[PDB]
Design a protein around this motif. Structure first.
Motif, PDB file in Angstrom:
ATOM      1  N   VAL A 195       0.814  -1.197   0.000  1.00  0.00           N
ATOM      2  CA  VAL A 195       0.000   0.000   0.000  1.00  0.00           C
ATOM      3  C   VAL A 195       0.868   1.276   0.000  1.00  0.00           C
ATOM      4  O   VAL A 195       0.673   2.170  -0.821  1.00  0.00           O
ATOM      5  N   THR A 196       1.831   1.362   0.908  1.00  0.00           N
ATOM      6  CA  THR A 196       2.613   2.574   0.999  1.00  0.00           C
ATOM      7  C   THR A 196       3.372   2.833  -0.295  1.00  0.00           C
ATOM      8  O   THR A 196       3.533   3.977  -0.698  1.00  0.00           O
ATOM      9  N   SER A 197       3.841   1.772  -0.948  1.00  0.00           N
ATOM     10  CA  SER A 197       4.593   1.912  -2.200  1.00  0.00           C
ATOM     11  C   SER A 197       3.682   2.284  -3.367  1.00  0.00           C
ATOM     12  O   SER A 197       4.087   3.016  -4.258  1.00  0.00           O
ATOM     13  N   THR A 198       2.456   1.782  -3.356  1.00  0.00           N
ATOM     14  CA  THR A 198       1.459   2.147  -4.356  1.00  0.00           C
ATOM     15  C   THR A 198       1.195   3.652  -4.326  1.00  0.00           C
ATOM     16  O   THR A 198       0.937   4.252  -5.364  1.00  0.00           O
ATOM     17  N   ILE A 199       1.304   4.258  -3.147  1.00  0.00           N
ATOM     18  CA  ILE A 199       1.088   5.679  -2.991  1.00  0.00           C
ATOM     19  C   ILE A 199       2.336   6.526  -3.252  1.00  0.00           C
ATOM     20  O   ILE A 199       2.262   7.499  -3.999  1.00  0.00           O
ATOM     21  N   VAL A 200       3.467   6.187  -2.626  1.00  0.00           N
ATOM     22  CA  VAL A 200       4.640   7.078  -2.648  1.00  0.00           C
ATOM     23  C   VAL A 200       5.906   6.514  -3.309  1.00  0.00           C
ATOM     24  O   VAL A 200       6.951   7.175  -3.332  1.00  0.00           O
ATOM     25  N   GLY A 201       5.812   5.324  -3.880  1.00  0.00           N
ATOM     26  CA  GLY A 201       6.951   4.729  -4.577  1.00  0.00           C
ATOM     27  C   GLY A 201       7.602   5.669  -5.578  1.00  0.00           C
ATOM     28  O   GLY A 201       6.910   6.264  -6.392  1.00  0.00           O
ATOM     29  N   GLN A 202       8.926   5.802  -5.529  1.00  0.00           N
ATOM     30  CA  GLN A 202       9.634   6.784  -6.373  1.00  0.00           C
ATOM     31  C   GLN A 202       9.809   6.288  -7.795  1.00  0.00           C
ATOM     32  O   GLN A 202       9.993   5.092  -8.019  1.00  0.00           O
ATOM     33  N   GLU A 203       9.743   7.208  -8.757  1.00  0.00           N
ATOM     34  CA  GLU A 203       9.818   6.836 -10.169  1.00  0.00           C
ATOM     35  C   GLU A 203      11.212   6.274 -10.473  1.00  0.00           C
ATOM     36  O   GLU A 203      12.206   6.713  -9.898  1.00  0.00           O
ATOM     37  N   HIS A 204      11.256   5.285 -11.364  1.00  0.00           N
ATOM     38  CA  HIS A 204      12.506   4.607 -11.767  1.00  0.00           C
ATOM     39  C   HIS A 204      12.996   3.596 -10.754  1.00  0.00           C
ATOM     40  O   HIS A 204      14.024   2.967 -10.946  1.00  0.00           O
ATOM     41  N   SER A 205      12.229   3.404  -9.691  1.00  0.00           N
ATOM     42  CA  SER A 205      12.432   2.304  -8.772  1.00  0.00           C
ATOM     43  C   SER A 205      11.554   1.122  -9.224  1.00  0.00           C
ATOM     44  O   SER A 205      10.811   1.241 -10.201  1.00  0.00           O
ATOM     45  N   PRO A 206      11.638  -0.021  -8.525  1.00  0.00           N
ATOM     46  CA  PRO A 206      10.793  -1.162  -8.862  1.00  0.00           C
ATOM     47  C   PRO A 206       9.299  -0.909  -8.706  1.00  0.00           C
ATOM     48  O   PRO A 206       8.516  -1.546  -9.403  1.00  0.00           O
ATOM     49  N   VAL A 207       8.903  -0.019  -7.790  1.00  0.00           N
ATOM     50  CA  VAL A 207       7.487   0.376  -7.646  1.00  0.00           C
ATOM     51  C   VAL A 207       7.321   1.896  -7.740  1.00  0.00           C
ATOM     52  O   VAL A 207       7.764   2.638  -6.883  1.00  0.00           O
ATOM     53  N   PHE A 208       6.690   2.340  -8.818  1.00  0.00           N
ATOM     54  CA  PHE A 208       6.397   3.748  -9.054  1.00  0.00           C
ATOM     55  C   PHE A 208       4.948   3.985  -8.674  1.00  0.00           C
ATOM     56  O   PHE A 208       4.037   3.528  -9.361  1.00  0.00           O
ATOM     57  N   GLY A 209       4.758   4.686  -7.562  1.00  0.00           N
ATOM     58  CA  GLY A 209       3.445   4.955  -7.010  1.00  0.00           C
ATOM     59  C   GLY A 209       2.770   6.144  -7.664  1.00  0.00           C
ATOM     60  O   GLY A 209       3.351   6.790  -8.523  1.00  0.00           O
ATOM     61  N   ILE A 210       1.538   6.433  -7.247  1.00  0.00           N
ATOM     62  CA  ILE A 210       0.729   7.475  -7.870  1.00  0.00           C
ATOM     63  C   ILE A 210       1.208   8.874  -7.534  1.00  0.00           C
ATOM     64  O   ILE A 210       1.168   9.750  -8.378  1.00  0.00           O
ATOM     65  N   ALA A 211       1.652   9.076  -6.296  1.00  0.00           N
ATOM     66  CA  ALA A 211       1.921  10.416  -5.766  1.00  0.00           C
ATOM     67  C   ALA A 211       3.255  10.474  -5.055  1.00  0.00           C
ATOM     68  O   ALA A 211       3.315  10.801  -3.870  1.00  0.00           O
ATOM     69  N   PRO A 212       4.341  10.178  -5.776  1.00  0.00           N
ATOM     70  CA  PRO A 212       5.668  10.035  -5.161  1.00  0.00           C
ATOM     71  C   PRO A 212       6.279  11.279  -4.533  1.00  0.00           C
ATOM     72  O   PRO A 212       7.245  11.141  -3.785  1.00  0.00           O
ATOM     73  N   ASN A 213       5.753  12.472  -4.821  1.00  0.00           N
ATOM     74  CA  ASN A 213       6.324  13.718  -4.251  1.00  0.00           C
ATOM     75  C   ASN A 213       5.485  14.305  -3.106  1.00  0.00           C
ATOM     76  O   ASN A 213       5.733  15.419  -2.648  1.00  0.00           O
ATOM     77  N   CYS A 214       4.495  13.545  -2.642  1.00  0.00           N
ATOM     78  CA  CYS A 214       3.696  13.923  -1.476  1.00  0.00           C
ATOM     79  C   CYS A 214       4.422  13.549  -0.196  1.00  0.00           C
ATOM     80  O   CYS A 214       5.392  12.803  -0.228  1.00  0.00           O
ATOM     81  N   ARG A 215       3.972  14.094   0.926  1.00  0.00           N
ATOM     82  CA  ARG A 215       4.539  13.779   2.227  1.00  0.00           C
ATOM     83  C   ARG A 215       3.721  12.666   2.832  1.00  0.00           C
ATOM     84  O   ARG A 215       2.499  12.783   2.921  1.00  0.00           O
ATOM     85  N   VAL A 216       4.385  11.604   3.265  1.00  0.00           N
ATOM     86  CA  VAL A 216       3.697  10.441   3.778  1.00  0.00           C
ATOM     87  C   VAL A 216       4.193  10.132   5.168  1.00  0.00           C
ATOM     88  O   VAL A 216       5.398  10.070   5.416  1.00  0.00           O
ATOM     89  N   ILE A 217       3.252   9.998   6.092  1.00  0.00           N
ATOM     90  CA  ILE A 217       3.553   9.545   7.424  1.00  0.00           C
ATOM     91  C   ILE A 217       2.858   8.212   7.604  1.00  0.00           C
ATOM     92  O   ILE A 217       1.637   8.146   7.530  1.00  0.00           O
ATOM     93  N   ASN A 218       3.628   7.156   7.830  1.00  0.00           N
ATOM     94  CA  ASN A 218       3.053   5.877   8.246  1.00  0.00           C
ATOM     95  C   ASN A 218       2.814   5.900   9.742  1.00  0.00           C
ATOM     96  O   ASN A 218       3.679   6.328  10.498  1.00  0.00           O
ATOM     97  N   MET A 219       1.642   5.435  10.159  1.00  0.00           N
ATOM     98  CA  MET A 219       1.342   5.245  11.567  1.00  0.00           C
ATOM     99  C   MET A 219       1.097   3.756  11.836  1.00  0.00           C
ATOM    100  O   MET A 219      -0.045   3.302  11.855  1.00  0.00           O
ATOM    101  N   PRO A 220       2.173   2.985  12.042  1.00  0.00           N
ATOM    102  CA  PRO A 220       2.017   1.535  12.174  1.00  0.00           C
ATOM    103  C   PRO A 220       1.197   1.116  13.375  1.00  0.00           C
ATOM    104  O   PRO A 220       1.274   1.749  14.399  1.00  0.00           O
ATOM    105  N   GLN A 221       0.408   0.065  13.224  1.00  0.00           N
ATOM    106  CA  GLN A 221      -0.345  -0.503  14.330  1.00  0.00           C
ATOM    107  C   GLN A 221       0.137  -1.926  14.648  1.00  0.00           C
ATOM    108  O   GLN A 221      -0.612  -2.734  15.196  1.00  0.00           O
ATOM    109  N   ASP A 222       1.385  -2.219  14.288  1.00  0.00           N
ATOM    110  CA  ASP A 222       1.964  -3.553  14.434  1.00  0.00           C
ATOM    111  C   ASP A 222       1.779  -4.072  15.858  1.00  0.00           C
ATOM    112  O   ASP A 222       1.319  -5.204  16.040  1.00  0.00           O
ATOM    113  N   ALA A 223       2.104  -3.250  16.852  1.00  0.00           N
ATOM    114  CA  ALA A 223       2.007  -3.662  18.259  1.00  0.00           C
ATOM    115  C   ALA A 223       0.611  -4.188  18.620  1.00  0.00           C
ATOM    116  O   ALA A 223       0.479  -5.025  19.512  1.00  0.00           O
TER     117      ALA A 223
END
Lengths: 9, 330
Positions: free
Chosen positions: B108-136
């Motif tokens: 999911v995070t890569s679908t959104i912010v993945g950088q161009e010319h990498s293996p996953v180019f996301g939709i909005a790579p120049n936006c600011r993304v904060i992940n808030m993990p709920q792993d715990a």
């Protein structure tokens, strides 16, 4: 097993 | 001609033209409420990503690369259903459920912010993304509301809520309802998936008023049989590419294609991010509700002679070019 987030099938 | 060729250009009319005008703006912040993604992947190199762990969680034990390797081996074999869970149980019984979350958060995070010319180019790579993990209970409405409040305090323009809490109706706990309304009152979009239950059950927050509900489309644009629909899913939801969506998995530069509403939701979070970025680039004020209603009102309904139950497409398939007309006059 619910097929979420990724669906298998 | 597409200046930034993206894997979904052929499935999403208008994407290419939108990427020609923007790849995102740093003034637009997306907070992703999901598991814990792997920032060491190259698709995040130079992406403006950061983690914020909710302070009221105790952090979980880290997960070994070996456990992730086990998960991915069982996926690569193409095992499914009962056989898959017996496999997962045999090798990683104590980490299988956390890996499902964290893996999906990578994707999911890569679908959104993945950088161009990498293996996953996301939709909005120049936006600011904060992940808030709920792993715990971790998907409880209480905890999602708490997460939401924090995402707002952190300055979210969009909150991507990766979670589906079951429900058989549009009722959720009031605490969560209030959190969603609070997002609307503060001009913050919430996107979340409708779920993969084939309408055996529905999902919170998708079915609550105010959220942008997202359903999953096949390659051909018809809705995936499993993608939930009806009620507020249909009234306030949109259909987007959900099958075979390219994205990251932890510990490896090799990407993987996944299927589900959880993979369609991110695409809409991304499309929404770009539409908001474009408002900023053009000196217009940022307007979440305009963006949401623009996407909904221009969504293309499925043809009843091709799809048996058109309400499965919710308000319709995402229609960037219509959205652009409404918001920008193109």
């Amino acid at each position: 097993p619910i097929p979420f987030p990724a669906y298998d099938g | 001609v597409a200046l930034h060729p993206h894997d979904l250009d052929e499935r999403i009319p208008g994407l290419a033209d939108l990427h020609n005008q923007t790849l995102g703006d740093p003034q637009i912040t997306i907070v992703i409420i999901d598991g814990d993604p792997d920032y060491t992947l190259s698709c995040f190199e130079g992406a403006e990503v950061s983690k914020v762990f909710p302070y009221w969680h105790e952090p979980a034990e880290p997960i070994t690369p070996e456990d992730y390797a086990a998960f991915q081996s069982i996926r690569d074999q193409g095992l499914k259903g009962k056989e898959k869970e017996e496999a997962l149980e045999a090798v990683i019984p104590d980490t299988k459920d956390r890996i499902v979350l964290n893996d999906a958060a990578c994707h999911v995070t890569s679908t959104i912010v993945g950088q161009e010319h990498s293996p996953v180019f996301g939709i909005a790579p120049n936006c600011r993304v904060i992940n808030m993990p709920q792993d715990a209970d971790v998907m409880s409405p209480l905890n999602l509301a708490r997460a939401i409040d924090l995402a707002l305090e952190l300055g979210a323009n969009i909150i991507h809520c990766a979670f589906c809490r079951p429900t058989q109706t549009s009722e959720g706990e009031e605490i969560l309802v209030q959190a969603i309304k609070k997002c609307q009152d503060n001009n913050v979009l919430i996107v979340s998936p409708t779920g993969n239950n084939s309408n055996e059950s529905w999902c919170l927050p998708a079915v609550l008023p105010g959220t942008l509900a997202v359903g999953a489309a096949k390659v051909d644009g018809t809705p995936c049989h499993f993608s939930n629909w009806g009620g507020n899913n249909t009234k306030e939801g949109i259909l987007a590419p959900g099958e075979e969506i390219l994205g990251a998995q932890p510990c490896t530069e090799e990407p993987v294609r996944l299927t589900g509403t959880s993979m369609a939701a991110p695409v809409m979070t991304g499309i929404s991010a770009l539409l908001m970025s474009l408002q900023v680039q053009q000196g217009k004020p940022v307007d979440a509700e305009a963006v949401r209603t623009a996407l909904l009102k221009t969504a293309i309904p499925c043809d009843p002679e091709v799809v048996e139950e058109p309400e499965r497409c919710l308000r319709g398939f995402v229609n960037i070019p219509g959205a652009m007309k409404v918001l920008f006059g193109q």
